[PDB]
Amino acid sequence: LAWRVIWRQLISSVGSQARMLRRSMLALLLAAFMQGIAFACLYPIIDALLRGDAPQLLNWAMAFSVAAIVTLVLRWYGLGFEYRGHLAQATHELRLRLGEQLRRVPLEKLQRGRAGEMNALLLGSVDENLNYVIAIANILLLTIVTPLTASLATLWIDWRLGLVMLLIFPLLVPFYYWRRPAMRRQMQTLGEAHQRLSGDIVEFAQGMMVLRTCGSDADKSRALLAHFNALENLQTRTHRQGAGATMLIASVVELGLQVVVLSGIVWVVTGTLNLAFLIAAVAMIMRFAEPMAMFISYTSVVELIASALQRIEQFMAIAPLPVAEQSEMPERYDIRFDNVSYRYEEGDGYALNHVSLTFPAASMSALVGASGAGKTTVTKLLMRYADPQQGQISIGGVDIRRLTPEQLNSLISVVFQDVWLFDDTLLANIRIARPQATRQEVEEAARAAQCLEFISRLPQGWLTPMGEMGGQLSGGERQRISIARALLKNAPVVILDEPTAALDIESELAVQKAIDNLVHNRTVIIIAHRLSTIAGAGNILVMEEGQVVEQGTHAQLLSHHGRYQALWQAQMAARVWRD
Amino acid sequence: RFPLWQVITPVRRKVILAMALAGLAALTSLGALLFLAWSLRDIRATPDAIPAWPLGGVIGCVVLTFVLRLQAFNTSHYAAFHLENILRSRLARKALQLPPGVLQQMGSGSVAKVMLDDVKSLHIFVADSTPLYARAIIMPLATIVILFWLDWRLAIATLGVLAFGSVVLVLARQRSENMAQRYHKAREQVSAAVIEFVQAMPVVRTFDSGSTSFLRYQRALEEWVDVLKTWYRKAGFSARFSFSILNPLPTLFVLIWSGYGLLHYGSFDFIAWVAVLLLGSGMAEAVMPMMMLNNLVAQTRLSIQRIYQVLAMPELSLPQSDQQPQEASITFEQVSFHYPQARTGAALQEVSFHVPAGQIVALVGPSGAGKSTVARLLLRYADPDKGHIRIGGVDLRDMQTDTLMKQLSFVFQDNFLFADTIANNIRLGAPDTPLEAVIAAARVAQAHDFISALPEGYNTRVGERGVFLSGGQRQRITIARALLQDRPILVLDEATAFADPENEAALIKALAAAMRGRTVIMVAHRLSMVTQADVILLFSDGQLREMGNHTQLLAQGGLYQRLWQHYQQAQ
Ligand SMILES: [Mg+2]
Ligand SMILES: [Mg+2]
């Protein structure tokens, strides 16, 4: 709202180039003032004409020429912010700052949004914020400052003409105040619509395989076309709403500038005003009427910049999970839960209710249970996905909240259920866990995950490009690449969540070989519905409806009839399809 | 090929109307300046009389000028909105009609860039330049004639100013050549990096600790900023010169010095000079608004070239015979397939097998064998290099897309949910489906129990990829979505993964009770599913190595014996 807040937002958004932006705007303002002065030089020049006084005609023509030269050089230098790389540098710095904020925002709240919606902010909102600042500044300074200076100098030439020329600038204020809420609402609505459309388009692209199956012409794509038509109707309605206001503003401005000339003509025929000064004023007005009529329309870009700044600051206002009473590196790696009860956002589940457990160091523990029990919740809260409302989780004797996210992510290496590969080469996909590793170490990690076989069968070798989500690889190959990625990173705690869902029996045994090798010197947490792989665990934790119902080892759990025994019987139970 | 002229074809009538009204407004503005110059001349000749008729002429011409300008701008804006809608709809339809492999390779970030940002860039051009183009082509052409009729020497001077500006602008043309490809690739890579950063945040935070934010995102940002700096430097001179040569000050400077020279030569006419000064805004100041948006118009031109490059991609050879299947039986005849990426060997070498209707065919083999490959080829993901895939005797190539997809209900290996509602996700492709059918389909699977447990029930919201829902729960939702269709062949790609054995057994028994005569294609690594099936097909290294029942393949003593023995020893 307040222009001071808008100014400080713009300065913050520009960042290190704030002084360059201020200097460029000062140059543009000086150029507008000097252009107004140059127009003011017409009054003696036209008075020099009609009389033939060549000496002072040249004397004032030199002044006009130097004024025009200063105006041209000032505008050329002030517009360099767009073309000398300062705008690009500011955009790059803003993108870097926004990207870092993505790295620090709580992951739970971030997952409540959409990737396409965030794409419209880090990419589109930035260009709406910065790409038109210099141009809009140049247009508004030309629109207002130059005619203002011309009228102020007319006041020196003729106080009656100057006063009536100046009387239009107060007239623009009520129209601007009347039209500002409409422009603000229109810009906000268009921004929200564009963000929603970006999210919908990204989701539509990411699910073309599912969409093609349903068929029936277009059903979800029918919703996409409905969104397109709704955007068209929104834009058309907004334009129609402001068309009458724009017509009224243009009429009022251009006819208030058409009564200045009439008053000057009346004064001239009355004999109290010089005809040459009248011609100079008329030339100024005719060269000023068109830009001044649509000054309010020009303020729409300022409203757009303000809306982009507001969206960017709202995104940047998200606070990270507090790091209270910062501590040092834990020396043991025995994860302990203590009365942990976690509730998901917008979820009444109260999952992981009053859960207390222990993950001994230099051992391997397993989590079993039904789908939705809360094992992935345990894995996520161990990575500080969200703060527990009750209970404490400690890597060693140190609570997670006493650590910064960097340290915790350094102590944790995870194979995720949702296997995610990066859109680059396989070598870099494995190496991102620990880039400062020897190629022999990378090959050893690949061998441990039993993935060198199909890497050898890759014509591009390790340089084979991986598509979005690692599409070019199979599910098992991608999952083994993720396993190798986690293996390459040397972390005290290794959390694997269903490591072998998409692996065959031989590949799964080969992977379990390295998993068992990991046990001796690393804390290992393993999630598995294939109970055969995790039968050898030192401890097995049974989860049901967010509670750890039963504890024990493979022999101990199978000795007493419980949920683990029932799960093993179901796994061993034959499956009948009846033809 | 004039891309700017090409894009306005769907809204050509309205664009031409805007051009015509802008030209009419320009001519009316010239008339206003002529009437006002006549008023000044009358005042000069008679310093005691009001030029009432010329003043009425100038005020009326001013009124018509701004009315026509505003109406033309409104027409241009409506045409721009209509063109944006048409282009976005055409892009969405092309994306639907594009082959799945081509669209997957091009990327979701590229789709977001072309569909949203490139179409958005059309607004600047269509709604804010075509009236300005019309003004810049109308005012100078009439103004030069008017000034030659008025005073040919000042006309020559101002025409020389305009010619100097135009010649300098034409000489300095970057042409946007040999760098459009890099500009695009940088733009879509930045978009894809942002999307990848957002959707893979747990992996980024866990592993990518080397760089603040995300490393690939940083690399893309640096490439984009290099491209932007190069583009801005290459276009700086033309833009800044057009901003200083089309300013009123150069024209006024030349006119004033020419008038002084004429006074020195004893041939200066005051009224003609005044009328030239009033009318001189039409030659060089008319092109000024267009050059204020020339750079954004160049960006729009690049985006237009990208859009029309996207629309120029080949489709998946749709036929016109429209033959129908009548058997619901699958046949692979010596099919060989290579993915667009030039992988060594082949995904499939000589695959050939017949699955008659009603058969519970189970697909087994090690990872990378090509089970998902044959499933995708059945789904018309691409076309086989050799052989033929047929459903009910008729080839897939000899089918309409609707005809082929009315045959197969497919459960993908990757479980994707379109956010939205669980009930909406299950009823995808048919919003009119009653909730009773959705609940029945979820009861065929095991999703209904956990769905009822959720507080909003079926109307529970799920994340962009289904992140608000468990992996096993997400797969159950996808299974229910496929089952709601009731299509003749049901293909599953590891549908019982991410699930505990109790849920797996319940799903198997319920689905066996459900797909009684339906042909069921099964991809499963858990061999407990395939121990009782109508036929088992084993793939290894892209070759169909074995085919038969569990007993048959066990007695054969081949690749299936080792797999089954290892699986049984494990459990
Ligand atoms: Mg999970
Ligand atoms: Mg697969």
Alpha carbon distance B160, A533 (integer Å)? 87
A202 C-alpha to ligand 2 centroid (Å): 23
For residue A355, list its beta bridge partners: A340
C-alpha to C-alpha distances, B214 to A222, A422, B205, nearest whole angstrom: 35, 11, 9
Alpha carbon distance B243, A310 (integer Å)? 31
Q: What's the one-letter identity of residue A472?
A: Q
Q: Which residues of B are less than 8 Å from A251 in CB distance? A: 63, 66
For residue A495, list its beta bridge partners: A414, A525
Query: Tell me, which fold does domain A335-572 have in CATH?
Result: Rossmann fold (3.40.50)
Task: Answer yes or no: do B566 and A509 touch at CB < 8 A.
Answer: yes
Q: Which residues of A are less than 8 Å from B151 in CB distance? A: none
C-alpha to C-alpha distances, B192 to A200, A319, B93, nearest whole angstrom: 15, 26, 21
Decide the pairing of beta strands A493-497 and A412-415.
parallel
Of A577, A509, A531, give the one whose Cα is nearest residue B362: A577
Q: What's the one-letter identity of residue B282?
A: G
Three-state SS annotation for B242-294: HHHHCCHHHHHHHHHHHHHHHHHCCCCCHHHHHHHHHHHHHCCCCCHHHHHHH
B88 C-alpha to ligand 2 centroid (Å): 33
Q: Which residue has the tokens 């009429």?
A: A251
Nearest CB among B70, B281, B430 relative to A247 is that of B70
Nearest CB among B345, B379, B502 relative to A370 is that of B502
Q: Which residues of B are less than 8 Å from A89 in CB distance? A: 225, 229
DSSP annotation of B209: -
Alpha carbon distance B352, A489 (integer Å)? 44
Nearest CB among A96, A199, A567 relative to B502 is that of A567
Nearest CB among B96, B532, B566 relative to A575 is that of B532
Task: Pick the residue of B71, B116, B223 with the most A CBs within 10 A to test the interface with A by mutation.
Answer: B116
Alpha carbon distance A87, A100 (integer Å)? 20
Residue B233 contacts residue B172 (beta carbons within 8 Å):
no
Task: Answer yes or no: do B525 and A502 touch at CB < 8 A.
Answer: yes
Task: Pick the residue of B89, B215, B227, B249 with the most A CBs within 10 A to test the interface with A by mutation.
Answer: B249
Alpha carbon distance B117, A194 (integer Å)? 10
Alpha carbon distance A420, A414 (integer Å)? 12
Residue B109 burial (10 A CB sphere; 0-12, 13-18, 19+): buried
Residue B19 contacts residue B130 (beta carbons within 8 Å):
yes
Does residue A525 sit in helix, strand or coil?
Answer: strand
Residue A231 contacts residue A195 (beta carbons within 8 Å):
no
**Residue B455 at interface with chain A, using a CB cutoff of 8 Å:** yes
Tokens representing A459 are 């014509």
Q: Does the annotation place B413 within a ligand binding site?
A: yes
Smallest CA–CA separation between B311 and chain A, in Å? Answer: 15
Alpha carbon distance B551, B555 (integer Å)? 6
Task: Answer yes or no: do A383 and B240 touch at CB < 8 A.
Answer: no
Tokens representing B207 are 């592993």
Query: Cβ contacts of residue A204 below 8 Å, gap of 6+?
Result: A211, A220, A221, A224, B92, B95, B111
Q: Which residue has the tokens 């200066």?
A: B268
**Residue B203 at interface with chain A, using a CB cutoff of 8 Å:** yes
For residue B410, count other CB atoms closer than 10 A to its CB: 23
Nearest CB among A95, A208, A458 relative to B103 is that of A208
State the method: cryo-EM
A374 C-alpha to ligand 2 centroid (Å): 27
C-alpha dihedral sign at A301, A307, A310, A314: negative
Q: What is the largest CA-CA distance in chain A?
A: 119
B375 C-alpha to ligand 2 centroid (Å): 9
Three-state SS annotation for B393-450: CEECCCCCHHHHHCCEEEECCCCCCCCCEHHHHHCCCCCCCCHHHHHHHHHHCCHHHH
Tokens representing A554 are 């493979």
Query: Cβ contacts of residue B518 below 8 Å, gap of 6+?
Result: B358, B488, B489, B490
Alpha carbon distance A178, A172 (integer Å)? 10
Of B9, B285, B196, give the one whose Cα is nearest residue A119: B196
Smallest CA–CA separation between B3 and chain A, in Å? Answer: 23
Task: Answer yes or no: do A254 and B66 touch at CB < 8 A.
Answer: yes
Smallest CA–CA separation between A109 and chain B, in Å? Answer: 11
Region A3-316: CATH code: 1.20.1560.10
Of A128, A129, A113, give the one whose Cα is nearest residue A196: A113
Question: In chain B, what are the helix, strand and coil shares in percent, each to the nearest 5?
Answer: 60, 10, 30
Of B214, B208, B211, give the one whose Cα is nearest residue B194: B214
Q: What's the one-letter identity of residue A40?
A: A
Residue A116 contacts residue B195 (beta carbons within 8 Å):
yes
List the 121-180 stretch of B: residues with Cβ below 8 A of A: none
Alpha carbon distance B241, B70 (integer Å)? 28
Closest alpha carbon within chain A to B221: A92
Does residue B387 sit in helix, strand or coil?
Answer: strand
Alpha carbon distance B360, B493 (integer Å)? 14
Alpha carbon distance B391, B408 (integer Å)? 10
Decide the pairing of beta strands A335-341 and A355-359.
antiparallel
Domain definitions of chain B by residue range: 5-323, 324-571
Q: What resolution in angstrom units was achieved for this structure?
A: 3.1
Alpha carbon distance A463, A449 (integer Å)? 18
Does residue B493 sit in helix, strand or coil?
Answer: strand
Task: Answer yes or no: do B243 and A76 touch at CB < 8 A.
Answer: yes
Closest alpha carbon within chain A to B230: A85
Q: Which residues of A are less than 8 Å from B477 in CB distance? A: none
Alpha carbon distance A545, A372 (integer Å)? 7
CA angle B480, B483, B487 (to 5 degrees): 155
Tokens representing A124 are 């589109």
Q: Which residues of A are less than 8 Å from B485 in CB distance? A: 214
Residue A470 contacts residue A481 (beta carbons within 8 Å):
yes
Q: What would you report as the CA-atom Rg of chain A, rounded to the nearest whole angstrom? A: 35
Task: Answer yes or no: do A88 and B232 touch at CB < 8 A.
Answer: yes
List the 316-355 stretch of B: residues with Cβ below 8 A of A: 339, 341-345
Nearest CB among B66, B500, B505 relative to A370 is that of B500
- Give the ligand with the smallest distance to the CA of B493: 2
Alpha carbon distance B123, B569 (integer Å)? 66
Nearest CB among B88, B112, B232 relative to A119 is that of B112
Element (H, E) at A493: strand A493-497
Alpha carbon distance A104, B523 (integer Å)? 40
List the 272-301 stretch of B: residues with Cβ below 8 A of A: 273-274, 277-278, 281, 285, 292
Task: Answer yes or no: do A458 and B344 touch at CB < 8 A.
Answer: yes
Does residue A111 sit in helix, strand or coil?
Answer: helix
Annotated binding site of A: 376, 417
Task: Answer yes or no: do B111 and A202 touch at CB < 8 A.
Answer: yes
Residue B350 contacts residue B334 (beta carbons within 8 Å):
yes
**Residue B44 at interface with chain A, using a CB cutoff of 8 Å:** yes
- How many Cβ contacts (< 8 angstroms) between chains A and B? 509
Tokens representing B288 are 């000024």
B523 C-alpha to ligand 2 centroid (Å): 9
Task: Answer yes or no: do B78 and A38 touch at CB < 8 A.
Answer: no
DSSP annotation of A579: -
Dihedral angle at the C-alpha atoms of B55, B56, B58, B62, nearest 10 degrees? 140
Nearest CB among B50, B503, B567 relative to A269 is that of B50
Q: What's the one-letter identity of residue A112?
A: R
Task: Answer yes or no: do B429 and A204 touch at CB < 8 A.
Answer: no
Closest alpha carbon within chain A to B68: A247
CA angle B85, B86, B87 (to 5 degrees): 95
Closest alpha carbon within chain B to A221: B92
Closest alpha carbon within chain B to A476: B367
CATH class of B324-571: alpha beta
- Give the ligand with the smallest distance to the CA of B374: 2
Query: Cβ contacts of residue B358 below 8 Å, gap of 6+?
Result: A579, B517, B518, B519
Alpha helices in A207-219 (DSSP H): 208-214
**Residue B47 at interface with chain A, using a CB cutoff of 8 Å:** yes
Element (H, E) at B512: helix B501-514
Alpha carbon distance B196, A8 (integer Å)? 32
Residue A175 contacts residue A252 (beta carbons within 8 Å):
yes
Domain definitions of chain A by residue range: 3-316, 335-572
Tokens representing A468 are 């979005």
C-alpha dihedral sign at B80, B85, B86, B88: positive
Tokens representing B218 are 């940083």
Tokens representing B370 are 């090509």
Alpha carbon distance B395, B222 (integer Å)? 49
Q: Which residues have their alpha-adjacent CB atom under 5 A from ion ligand 2?
A: A 474-475; B 372, 413
